[PDB]
C-alpha cells in the first residue's frame, strides 16, 4: 500500500548523522524495513480521540497533531496498554514526560534503553545489524506546545500548555524532541520492524 510506502519514506528520509558518532543507536545511513503493521486498538484510539478533542477545544479548535517516532524496549506493552506517564521519571531533559522525535534515527537510539543500553539481547551490540528492532510511528497531540531550548525538569505540561517542544540550540539539542505528560495524548499507530544497515 501507498500508506506503508509513506511510513517507510518518513523512516528513511529523517535519518541524521548523530553527534555521539553512532554510540547509542549504531552506525548506519539507512534501514532495512522488514514489516509495517497498523495498530488497531479501539480502546486506545478512543482514549486518544477523546483527549485530542479536549486539547483542540483548549487550543483555538486545533489539536496540533503530528506523526512522530518513539523508540522503547517496551513497544509491546505500549501497543496493548498505551503510553503511560506513570512510567516516566523526572530525570529526563524535560522531566517526567513521554518523548518523541521527528527523526527516526533519534528514536532508534532508545530502542534498547537509555543511550542504547547494552544493545541487542542476543549479541549485546548497540550497532547490531542482525537483530530486528522495533520503532513506533505515532499520532501525537501537541496542542499549545511550550517552546524550550535548555533543560527544564517538569512533572507536567507548563501552565496553559499541552506539551513541550525541545528546539535545537548551541550547547544545546542537535535535533528537535516533543514531550507529552499524559499518556492519552499519543496513539501508537504503526509498529515498524527493521534493521539498521551497515554503511
Q: Does 73 bind ligand 3GN (CB under 6 A)?
A: no
**Is 50 annotated as ligand-binding?**
no
120 is in an annotated binding site: yes
Q: Is 112 an interacting residue with respect to ligand 3GN (CB under 6 A)?
A: no
Distance CA 4, CA 143 (A): 26
Q: Which of 18, 51, 52, 70 touches ligand 3GN (CB under 6 A)?
A: 70
Window 16 to 55, contacts with ligand 3GN (CB under 6 A): none
Contacts with Zn ion by CB under 5 A: the residue count is 6
The backbone region for 115, taken as left when phi is positive above 0, alpha when psi lies in -120 to 50, beta otherwise, is: left
The span of 11-19, 81-89, 130-138, 141-149 binding Zn ion (CB under 5 A) equals: 130-138
| 128 is annotated as contributing to ligand binding | yes
CA distance 126 to 34: 19
| Separation between Cα atoms, residue 53 and residue 16, nearest integer Å | 34
- Report the C-alpha dihedral over residues 108, 112, 198, 134, rounded to 10 degrees: -60
Joined together, the cell numbers standing for residue 65 give: 497533531
Provide the binding-site residues for ligand 3GN, judged by CB under 6 A.
Answer: 69-72, 92, 99-101, 106-107, 110, 114, 177
Amino acid at each position: 500500500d501507498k500508506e506503508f510506502q509513506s511510513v517507510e519514506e518518513e523512516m528513511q528520509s529523517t535519518v541524521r548523522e548523530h553527534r555521539d558518532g553512532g554510540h547509542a543507536g549504531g552506525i548506519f545511513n539507512r534501514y532495512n524495513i522488514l514489516k509495517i503493521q497498523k495498530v488497531c486498538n479501539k480502546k486506545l484510539w478512543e482514549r486518544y480521540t477523546h483527549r485530542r478533542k479536549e486539547v483542540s477545544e483548549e487550543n483555538h479548535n486545533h489539536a496540533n497533531e503530528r506523526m512522530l517516532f518513539h523508540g522503547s524496549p517496551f513497544v509491546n506493552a505500549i501497543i496493548h496498554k498505551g503510553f503511560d506517564e506513570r512510567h516516566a521519571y523526572i530525570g529526563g531533559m524535560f522531566g517526567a514526560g513521554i518523548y518523541f522525535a521527528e527523526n527516526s534515527s533519534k528514536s532508534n537510539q532508545y530502542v534498547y534503553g537509555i543511550g542504547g543500553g547494552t544493545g541487542c539481547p542476543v549479541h549485546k551490540d548497540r550497532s547490531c545489524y542482525i537483530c530486528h528492532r522495533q520503532l513506533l510511528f505515532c499520532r501525537v497531540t501537541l496542542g499549545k506546545s511550550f517552546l524550550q531550548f535548555s533543560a527544564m525538569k517538569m512533572a507536567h505540561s507548563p501552565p496553559g500548555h499541552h506539551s513541550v517542544t525541545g528546539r535545537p540550540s548551541v550547547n544545546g539539542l542537535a535535533l528537535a524532541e516533543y514531550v507529552i505528560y499524559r499518556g492519552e495524548q499519543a496513539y501508537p499507530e504503526y509498529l515498524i520492524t527493521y534493521q539498521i544497515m551497515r554503511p
